[model samples]
Target: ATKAVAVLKGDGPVQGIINFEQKESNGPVKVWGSIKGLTEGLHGFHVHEFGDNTAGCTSAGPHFNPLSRKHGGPKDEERHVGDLGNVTADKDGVADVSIEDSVISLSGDHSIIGRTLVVHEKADDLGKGGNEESTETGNAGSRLACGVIGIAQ
Candidate 1:
């Protein structure tokens, strides 16, 4: 039961605890976090490479695409590692998210530390997730909010 903490710092007050495990059956990173100051809707949440949360957190880079494949649904085998889907914010801009991903790890070469989580005002189609002709994901557009993730301890 490996555990790590990540801070969600940005324009909005996003404070929560991200818990991860490494020895899971399928090698997953379990996440549970409380968020605030959202737009009261579904916000696209994803894990990207790098840990730098500077410049409004736009430098976190794209989703962790270790397989270098097209972006599909979260349950899709051809999806990017960052395709964790969206987080819902209540009318009060508060919500709790619990997610599990096989691509995330605690203390290994595939560790998800030094990464980022972003919230988009719009929903990701998952059809345009790729660049070019990318028909995999609809390429959700616009960034509504963002947060930098880090290892706590």
Candidate 2:
């Protein structure tokens, strides 16, 4: 299997590492991470369009939607490739979640390497929030943390 990692950075206490693992053959990509310094609830987590974070989170551009699909949950087939769903924090402000995603890959056109991983301040409504941004960003609020995906040794 091949591995990759993203080291997150933020203004306040938010920080984390996202790990990705995938095999050479066709299969799901495994994603796992533990984030800290968030409220006791769900937060929107996604892979941004740009790998660059030199200008902060927004500079990372929008979600990695190469297919130009609507913003939806991880389970939506017509959703952005970056949509991996939400991560919930504990009472102590730590969120640890993992999933096997079939959309994101470590190679090819949909490769997530050289992209950005972001953690939003608000929970993602998964396009059911009935708001304009809901269809684009799931109404996920400001980004609390950001990271650039890189190949793991």
Candidate 3:
């Protein structure tokens, strides 16, 4: 049997169910879904360090940065080893997100499949597109909501 990637879709006021399955591509687990209940604009969405979804997603902690690196904003050339870019939501607080992480595997070596996805209230600071920025984007703001990745039925 082949492995499947977990998926989650949320509605406004933060209400929704989680689901998952096999993607068309036989590559690494591909997670694709939409998240509602977000602000009208940009929201930070990324895989966290843990698999705990008890905290309405908060249990997942920060990005899975095992390298002990600094949060230098997404897009930063030297940002957290686990620092993925942010997810963009539309005016209706809906974001279509699809991410493929080579660091994440189904074989349990460096898998992030069971990890969590966090939504922030603000935009991720893409280590300032400047000269001194450690990362290409800056630090994004507070965490708004969270969700855990699980096996799809």
Candidate 4:
């Protein structure tokens, strides 16, 4: 199995861990994420264009859209590679998410090994918000946390 992990960081005490696991090349990847210290609601979660976090979340740049597609859900065939969709937090401010996707990889051109995982302050409209920002960014609010993906042992 090929695996990677991202340890989140942000302005607040938001803490999160995201794991990517793939059993075979060209196969689906399983994503697991657990986040704490989020507001009680939905938050945008995605892979970003870069791994750099030297300037915090903003430095991570835009979504990982290698295909130059519009922002959409993970299952959308024409969406950005980074559009993994949203995660909802409970009243205790904790959010957990799990999903599978074939677009992401642990190796090769589609590999996300050097990308960043970002958590936003608001929910993503999933390209259905009918707004310009919605098409580009899903209208997700400010990034709340970020982490760089790295290979796991």
lDDT of each: 0.65, 0.90, 0.56, 0.90
What clash pairs does model 4 have? none
Candidate 4 lDDT trough over 10 residues, lowest sum? 73-82
Provide the TM-score for each candidate, comma-separated.
Answer: 0.78, 0.96, 0.67, 0.96
What pairs collide in candidate 2? none
* Collision count for each candidate, in order: 10, 0, 11, 0
C-alpha-based local distance difference test score of model 1: 0.65
lDDT of 1 by residue, 47-95 (tens): 7776666676677777777878777657777777777777787899886
**Given candidate 3, what's the lDDT at residue 15?**
29
* Ten residues in sequence with the least summed lDDT for candidate 2: 20-29
Q: Per-residue lDDT of 43-81 in model 3, one digit per residue for the tens?
A: 655567887766555566767766666555544445554
Q: Residue 77 error for model 4, in Å?
A: 1.9
Q: Model 4 compared with the native: what TM-score?
A: 0.96
lDDT of 2 by residue, 6-98 (tens): 988987789998899998646789999899899999999989999887888979998999999999999987789999889999999999979
Tens-place lDDT digits, model 4, residues 6-125: 999899979888898999998988999899999999899989999998899998999999888989988788799888899999999999979788898888888888889999998999
- Per-model C-alpha RMSD: 3.2, 1.1, 4.6, 1.0
lDDT of 4: 0.90
If candidate 3 were superposed on the true structure by all CA atoms, what would the RMSD be?
A: 4.6
Q: Name the runs in model 2 displaced over 4 angstroms.
A: none
